[PDB]
Design a protein around this ligand. Structure first.
Ligand SMILES: [Ca+2]
Ligand SMILES: [Cl-]
Ligand SMILES: [Fe+3]
Ligand SMILES: [Mg+2]
Length: 428
């Protein structure tokens, strides 16, 4: 954009990062849960990736500030999450110094870029840092003990008449994905724009709520194998799943260390893919495919056009969606009527990541971005395991990095992520 706007975005991302590591060194070195890196790992990894993609042209053979063996401590493919707490990592002071040195050089580089030069990598790195900010939030939510963060900023109230209900998405061709011409910082797996024929289906007007999930629990949903897939039931049994994560026996939940009543009308959060598909079956529905999801989000059947956001082309605001990290929770269903898609689906962007039944697959014409290992290793059959795509962003996602076409994914056994469920149905 303006180089000034990119600088602004990089600086906002780093402000966020530095708030999330504004704790004692011992906190930053802790393993809150074996699923998660220590925060000091994400801190240095953020700087190392910024250096690699913006100062070293993505070529690790070009010299960096760190010895290559030190740099490789921050290679996510080499070091499984659980092992990272024991690695000989840079201290918090070293990591902050490294990040600052890199950032100074990056801002100078941005200044010096020729007019009309390609800036894709800068936007890619903004996305990378904000994504790690959400990862660090996941870790802080898992942390046992008295809260470090506050309990979250105010959200609007919900409204009656939306929970449980569905909207029709009329059948036919629509444009899936985007081109760089339209979204200059769309990540590689979002591209290119192409047509897919999607038969008529219905999708939930809002996500599944906590009170709805409690009904599933109360009817014995976790005790009845018929709602679950073979793999899902086996995992439910292995892991002893009986409720969403952080729901306590006494009916409270623990959210960033805060013990509180579970609000009935918020989207359910911290459920596995396997839980999501079991609830959907028990409810008489199914999960959407990600293609269904994106059509419901972005397509306007009255005009036969894609919208930039579900509501139109206006930049996200606090009146339109719950984004950016400050709320530390999703909003009550019905809280954002102005954020509805053309078909009437609300809270598609923000609040909770929504499970879909789609594995990650390339769109026809896919070509990798400079960070070649960002998507490709996770495509179905690429040999990295089983993944399902999540859509729409959560309350923790920065508005700057989110689009209807954005594709998250994870193993179906993961629920420390800020994920919930929106139902779908076939139409006859
Ligand atoms: Ca969402
Ligand atoms: Cl990671
Ligand atoms: Fe990363
Ligand atoms: Mg009953």
């Amino acid at each position: 954009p303006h180089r000034a706007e990119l600088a602004r975005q990089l600086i906002d991302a780093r402000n966020r990062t530095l708030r999330l590591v504004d704790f004692d060194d011992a906190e930053l070195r802790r393993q809150y849960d074996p699923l998660m890196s220590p925060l000091v790992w994400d801190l240095a990894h953020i700087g190392q990736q910024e250096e690699l993609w913006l100062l070293r042209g993505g070529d690790p053979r070009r010299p960096g500030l760190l010895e290559p063996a030190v740099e490789q401590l921050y290679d996510a493919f080499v070091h499984p999450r659980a092992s990272r707490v024991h690695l000989p990592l840079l201290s918090p002071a070293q990591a902050r110094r490294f990040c600052a040195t890199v950032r100074s050089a990056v801002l100078d580089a941005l200044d010096r870029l020729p007019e009309d030069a390609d800036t894709f990598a800068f936007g890619m790195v903004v996305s990378h840092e904000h994504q790690h900010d959400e990862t660090m939030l996941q870790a802080l939510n898992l942390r046992s003990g008295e809260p470090l963060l506050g309990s979250g900023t105010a959200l609007p109230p919900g409204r009656p008449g939306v929970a449980g209900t569905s909207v029709l998405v009329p059948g036919g061709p629509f444009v899936l994905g985007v081109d760089l011409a339209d979204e200059p910082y769309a990540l590689d797996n979002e591209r290119p724009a192409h047509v897919v024929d999607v038969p008529a289906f219905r999708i939930g007007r809002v996500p599944v709520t906590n009170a709805e999930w409690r009904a599933f629990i109360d009817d014995g949903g976790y005790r009845q194998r018929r709602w679950w897939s073979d793999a899902g039931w086996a995992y439910r049994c292995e892991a002893g799943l009986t409720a969403p994560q952080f729901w306590n026996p006494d009916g409270t939940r623990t959210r960033f260390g805060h013990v509180e009543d579970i609000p009935p009308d918020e989207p359910v959060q911290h459920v596995t893919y396997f839980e999501a598909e079991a609830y959907a079956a028990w409810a008489g529905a199914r999960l959407p495919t990600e293609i269904e999801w994106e059509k419901a989000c972005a397509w306007d059947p009255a005009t036969g056009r894609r919208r930039r956001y579900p509501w139109g082309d206006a930049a996200p605001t606090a009146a339109l969606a719950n984004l950016g990290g400050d709320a530390l929770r999703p909003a009550p269903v019905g809280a954002y009527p102005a954020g509805a898609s053309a078909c009437g689906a609300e809270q598609m962007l923000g609040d909770v990541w929504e499970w879909t039944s789609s594995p990650l697959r390339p769109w026809p014409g896919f070509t990798p971005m400079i960070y070649q290992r960002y998507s490709q290793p996770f495509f179905e059959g690429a040999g990295s395991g089983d993944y399902r795509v999540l859509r729409g962003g959560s309350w923790a996602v920065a508005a700057d990095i989110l689009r209807p076409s954005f594709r998250n994914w994870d193993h179906p056994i993961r629920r420390q992520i800020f994920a919930g469920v929106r139902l779908a149905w076939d139409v006859d």
